[PDB]
């Protein structure tokens, strides 16, 4: 094919950083090499930074746009994920991703949202209005959505690395029972 790659900017966390995997095994370099078989020649430039809050996202966004020398054709923008695992406040996650994409406009970068979905160990008022950031926000900044990114890996735990380990209450008792004995023993009378 002719002429130079196509730029492309993963402007992400940990899921576009590739957390556990080696190299060339994050999504920006997989799907870097997906693309060839859509007639795309592209460099996707990996901005994926592991634990990046929306707001981290957005202290970032100018110094690494400037930070390019080629300037980006599209803008893949995937953050929430850990204001999710943190509890934040789903309308100030929506606040923050609004800057970023306000700023990418700007530019005039075209704008993919990976759109970003609440387990619901949060509960259901709490995931439905994290879920519903997304949709606004691609129709507020003419941004084209992708509406559940890790929807393939759903319902595949093979899938997952084995990572975090987060009892539930359930699990807490379930240790309690374990360990009650070696605890209680290891207290001098």
Known sequence: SMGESRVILAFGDSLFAGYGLDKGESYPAKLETALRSH??????????????????????????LDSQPDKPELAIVELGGNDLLR??????????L?????????????????????????????????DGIYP???????????????????????????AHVHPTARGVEELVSATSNAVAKALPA
């Not at 509890?87 to 923050?96: D, F, H, I, V």
């Not at 129709?139 to 509406?147: G, H, T, W």
């Not at 890790?150 to 690395?161: F, G, N, S, T, W």
């Open 136 to 162: 606004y926000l691609a129709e507020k900044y003419d941004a084209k959505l992708v509406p559940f990114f890790l929807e393939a890996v759903a319902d595949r735990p093979d899938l997952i690395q084995k």
């Open 98 to 130: 609004s800057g970023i994409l306000e700023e990418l406009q700007r530019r005039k970068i075209p704008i993919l949202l990976m759109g970003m979905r609440a387990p619901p160990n949060l509960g259901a008022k709490y995931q439905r209005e994290f």
């Open 39 to 64: 007639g795309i020649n592209a460099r996707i430039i990996n901005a994926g930074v592991s634990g990046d809050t929306t707001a981290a996202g957005l202290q970032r966004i100018k110094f690494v």
């Open 87 to 96: 509890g934040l406040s789903p309308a100030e996650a929506r606040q923050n």
